[model samples]
Target: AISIKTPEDIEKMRVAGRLAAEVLEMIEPYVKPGVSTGELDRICNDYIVNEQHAVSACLGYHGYPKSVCISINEVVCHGIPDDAKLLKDGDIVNIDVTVIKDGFHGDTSKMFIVGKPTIMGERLCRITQESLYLALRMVKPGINLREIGAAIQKFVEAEGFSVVREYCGHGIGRGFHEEPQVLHYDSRETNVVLKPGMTFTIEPMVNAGKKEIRTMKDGWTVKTKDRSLSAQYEHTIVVTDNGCEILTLRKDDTIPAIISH
Candidate 1:
């Protein structure tokens, strides 16, 4: 069943969201060349466990071995961090995080470029992040879930990029995942409706080339089928009467914040 957050529940989620954002900020400088993704995982996991006394929602959840997902280059999502996989110049990677505090979960992701990335790499990252907010701007009570996907797909395809249909954002709350699967593409089959207190994510995975994707041998990491660059951004959001609240808004966020309540 879909979850509805109360006023007290939203407050708890707000704290959890800010903690997750802090984790992303704390690890920003380490995204440079020569650092291993495994090293980043260790640092972030320690902070969440020791300083915040929060739980790493991804670790040991559904067999996810790491505390955070560090997807590099072609890896779209759920890329396991390995000590041998060292970051290098001109590499682009995405770090996704979800921290549970006081029985609530906060989720967010961001892109980092080591040294200098190609023009296409920067564009894919920027546009992918924008796609998420574009969808968010359309979220509000009384609107159907299809509008979110329509907003994302329209802008992405116009920029000569394709949206990943295999994976979509989902509801997050007391549990890591809830109901009302949020797709980034238009489909009439999903009949979920938005309402006040409805919280979910609107992450959009945009590829520089075709939208076709494949799973890695580990059965976790996802990558583009054509080996093109892919980028994604995520934020937990709650529907408001006028708009929506970004539960996991980050401090370094480029796009402006929008929330009615």
Candidate 2:
């Protein structure tokens, strides 16, 4: 069964979400060319533990060895941090950050361009992010969860893109991953009714190629089946009396044009 978050519980999650966003913002500038994924992982670990005094939810999550997930290029998700995996110009990386504070968990992720990505690469990333926002705008109490994925799949496919079917968004609160599995594409039935005080994530991983994916021998790093680029964006949100509130919003001064428009 899906769980509902109370006001006090939502506040706790907000605190955790804010800290997670701050950690991502603090490490944003460091996600450039010449930096290794391991280096970025260290920065995220230190900031979450030392600066924010929070625990990295991905550290030991389901045997995930890294404090943060740094998936680059074709890597869809769960890309382990390695010193050899260095960022290069025109490459894009998706950083997934989740933190726990005061017994609540906050999860958020975004795609970053190493330097200047190719036109197609940049457009794919932008479209994926926009898909998340479009899905978010449709979120409301009493709405069918199926509509969430329906909207995402429609916009993404209309752009000639594909959505990863294996991995999708999920509920977050108290536990790292909770009930009410969120699929990126439409399913036969998604009658899960959203209600006030409900909190969860809305992450859509869009692929530039086929929707198929495969895991590496390491048993963690998932990549596109055709090795095409992938982009993802996420936000931990709470359903409220009127609408949903994004708790994991960054406080950085560098605001993307998407938020204003």
Candidate 3:
């Protein structure tokens, strides 16, 4: 069964979410061409640990080494940060950050492009982000979980893009990954209905090519099978009586953190 957060729990999660969002905002200036992904990780780790007084959920998570997941170019998700991986001009990357505060977790990610991007790369990122917003606006107290996936799948596919199938958004709270598995594509397997107080993530990894992906031998990094560009955006939200609250919403987001259905 999926856990429903109490008001007290929701408050703590809001803190975790804000901190996670802060980490991403704080690291924005550092994500540039010629910078090593490892350095970016170190800076974010320091900010989350020292400044925010929070814990990095990705560190040592299922043997994951980095404080954050940095996926670049064809990388779909779970890309390990490394000094050897220096970002270059025209490269698109995603930085995923999850933070824990007072036993609650907040998870979110954003895509960044170093210098300029190809026409296709820019449009792919825009469409992926728009698809996420479409799903977020659908969150309410009575919709089926499948509605979220169906909306995302419909919007992404119509734009000539594909959604990654392997990794999906999940219910999150005290534990990093919780019940109520959230798929990006429409499937009838999970028949759960949305309810108030429910908290989960909506992260859609969109690929410019086919949706197929392969995991590296390291057991963490995932890349598009066709080596085409991929982009993703994530938000941790809590279901409310009317709509939802975007706990990990950033200041630069075009959408509001809170929505009224």
Candidate 4:
């Protein structure tokens, strides 16, 4: 069932969201060339456990070994962080983080450039972020779930990028995944109505080439079929009376976390 978050649930979700965003911000400077993804994982694990007193939602969840999902370049999402995988110059990586605090989960992801960013790589990242922002702006009580995907699909396609259809956003609260799978492309099947206090994530994985993707033998890593770069941005948000509140908003976010339509 699609759970409508209560006031107490909202408060706990905000704390979890802020902690997850902090983990992302704390790991930014360490994302440069030559750093191992395994080392990065350790740093985040320590901070989240000791400083934040929180748990990593990804760790030990569904047999996923990594504490965080760090996907590089063509790898679309769920790229397990490993000691052998070192950051290289010109590599654009997405660091996805989800923190569990007070039994609630906060999930979000951001893209980072290792040394220098190419024009296409930078544009893809920017456009992918914009696609998420566009969908976020459409959240309100009366809006249908399909409209969110429609907004993202239209914006991303217009920018010459394709949306990954296999993995869509989902409802999240006490459980890692709840109900109401949120698609990044327009679909008539997701015609559910939005309501105040309804919480879910809006994560769109945009590919620079064709929309096709292939999973590695690890059964978790997902990469683009054409080996073209892919970018993604995610945020957990809740429907509001007028607009919505971005629960996973970071301190460095350019736009306001709260949207009032």
Number of the top TM-score candidate = 3
Ranking by TM-score: 3, 4, 1, 2
Task: Give Cα-based local distance difference scores for all models.
Answer: 0.89, 0.88, 0.94, 0.92
lDDT of each residue in 80-108, candidate 1, tens digit only: 99998999998889999999999999999
Give the better candidate number (1 or 4) by TM-score. Answer: 4
How should the candidates be ordered by lDDT, best one leading?
Answer: 3, 4, 1, 2
Residues 1-261, candidate 4: write the lDDT tens digits: 677989989999899999999999999989999999999999999999999999999999999998999999999999998999999988999999999999999999999988978889999999999899888888899888898898899999998889999999999999898888999999978888888999999999999999999999999999999999999999999888898999888877777899998
lDDT of 4 at 91: 93
TM-scores for every predicted model: 0.97, 0.95, 0.99, 0.98
Q: Which pairs clash (backbone N, Cα, C closer than 3 Å) in model 2? A: none
Q: Residue 183 of candidate 1: its Cα lDDT? A: 91
Off by over 4 Å in 1: none
Candidate closer to the true structure by TM-score (higher is better), 1 or 3: 3
Question: Highest lDDT among the candidates is held by which one?
Answer: 3
Which residue segments of model 4 deviate by more than 4 Å? none
True-structure lDDT of candidate 2: 0.88
lDDT of 4 at 231: 94
TM-score winner between candidates 3 and 4 = 3
RMSD of 1: 1.2
Clashing pairs in 3: none
